[PDB]
Design an enzyme around this catalytic site. Sequence first.
Site, PDB file in Angstrom:
ATOM      1  N   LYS A 162       0.803  -1.222   0.000  1.00 13.89           N
ATOM      2  CA  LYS A 162       0.000   0.000   0.000  1.00 13.89           C
ATOM      3  C   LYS A 162       0.840   1.277   0.000  1.00 13.89           C
ATOM      4  O   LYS A 162       0.406   2.321   0.500  1.00 13.89           O
ATOM      5  CB  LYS A 162      -0.959   0.014   1.189  1.00 13.89           C
ATOM      6  CG  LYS A 162      -2.042  -1.076   1.115  1.00 13.89           C
ATOM      7  CD  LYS A 162      -2.815  -1.131   2.415  1.00 13.89           C
ATOM      8  CE  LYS A 162      -2.009  -1.639   3.610  1.00 13.89           C
ATOM      9  NZ  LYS A 162      -2.930  -1.911   4.769  1.00 13.89           N
ATOM     10  N   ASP A 198      -5.570  -5.936  10.228  1.00 14.50           N
ATOM     11  CA  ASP A 198      -6.879  -5.314  10.270  1.00 14.50           C
ATOM     12  C   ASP A 198      -8.016  -6.259   9.950  1.00 14.50           C
ATOM     13  O   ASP A 198      -9.115  -6.113  10.470  1.00 14.50           O
ATOM     14  CB  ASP A 198      -6.971  -4.064   9.412  1.00 14.50           C
ATOM     15  CG  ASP A 198      -6.481  -4.258   7.978  1.00 14.50           C
ATOM     16  OD1 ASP A 198      -6.629  -3.301   7.177  1.00 14.50           O
ATOM     17  OD2 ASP A 198      -5.867  -5.305   7.672  1.00 14.50           O
TER      18      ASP A 198
END
Length: 451
Positions: A162, A198
């Site tokens: 990311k 997450d």
Amino acid sequence: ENLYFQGMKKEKVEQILAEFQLQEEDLKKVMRRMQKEMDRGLRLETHEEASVKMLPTYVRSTPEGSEVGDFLSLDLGGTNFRVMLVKVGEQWSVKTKHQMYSIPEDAMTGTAEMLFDYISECISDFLDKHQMKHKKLPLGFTFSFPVRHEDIDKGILLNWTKGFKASGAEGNNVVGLLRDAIKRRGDFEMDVVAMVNDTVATMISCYYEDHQCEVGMIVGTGCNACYMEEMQNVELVEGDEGRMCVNTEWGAFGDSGELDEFLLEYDRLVDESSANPGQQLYEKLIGGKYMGELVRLVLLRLVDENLLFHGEASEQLRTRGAFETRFVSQVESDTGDRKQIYNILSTLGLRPSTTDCDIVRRACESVSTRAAHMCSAGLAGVINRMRESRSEDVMRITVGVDGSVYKLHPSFKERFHASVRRLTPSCEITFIESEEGSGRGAALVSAVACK
Ligand SMILES: Cn1ccnc1Sc1cc(C(=O)Nc2nccs2)c(N)cc1F
Ligand SMILES: OC[C@H]1O[C@H](O)[C@H](O)[C@@H](O)[C@@H]1O
């Protein structure tokens, strides 16, 4: 105008956008390839070569006995770093205080020292706003990157994803990096008791409202899923009893060529301009980090073919990242009067006609539908795998989901659910959106871990 010529331009656009279509059979193929890679990632023999790492999280079912009280939850995995105080009780969890911090560019792509120094600064700022750095809170770290765990509170970063690039992190114990930074500051103390992805935090946060939630999925900046695997199938951890959450890291599917026949010129361009070329290829078809950029490149193609904006692209349209993923959502939220679309495009320095707006909507729909459908193949592979591993003919399971693409896109969710369901006969899948999932999930794991 000449509606005939407007129509002809739209036909040509449709011929170009047709490339984004995936037939049900394509998705089944992707699903099967994903399942094949998942099998490979779980096996000792093939784990190292597996594109889908199926990382054991050390988050075990079911479990038994949680501590109560105050927990600090951290969340690192986007452009914002979040700190949360959560109360855990009876096990329920409630966000009590929260602060988000924008991470300076220098800290995301600098050194791990800078990054973790900034994190430690934020924790310090938060603990001071609420008068609590002398209280020693157990700390749960939602760290949304692939980690090879040795335990719930120890694991090495495999690689950034990311857009993160901070040097001196990969290969190191992430909890150690955090602990070292806190020590190098020395104005608060925290017992780091858990580090979770997450996906895992999202899944866990949904459990207490729905005990059948055994899958967590994120479709936000990135895209990933975790699920409760049978310990007997987790060859990387000792023991055959019960279940452990596995972090698929499915974003890296395709990194060994598994998506090659589906990758388009736009995907190649996104990949080649990214911080991690050649990596996270499946995620780059879906994640919000990449979706707007895919649309931008589609628009540039249409501009190049003289199908859009009079064949002229503004400075902004030619700026990397300028078509924000939120614009894809906003475009697809347009009620039909083209107003929202016009505003986005005008703000991008364009002078769009009604036909330009309609074409931009089609481009957005094409990219976001493909994202939904690709994502569905991953989730379906996971759920179908779980069904098989398990001993009921109809599996009723709940998937906890977070992420701005899934949550905010006007249509992604609907397309995604429909496609998952087509791919999962004999499953009844309930989707729940997590509420403060990262913070509450990390706290809930911490409340068990800190024993
Ligand atoms: C999703 N599901 C269903 C049954 N068990 C699970 S996973 C799950 C795990 C934990 C948990 O904290 N497990 C831990 N294992 C090791 C340290 S903490 C939890 N606090 C809550 C959960 F829901
Ligand atoms: O944030 C969603 C996902 O983004 C990327 O795929 C990360 O590698 C993964 O760990 C995370 O779960």
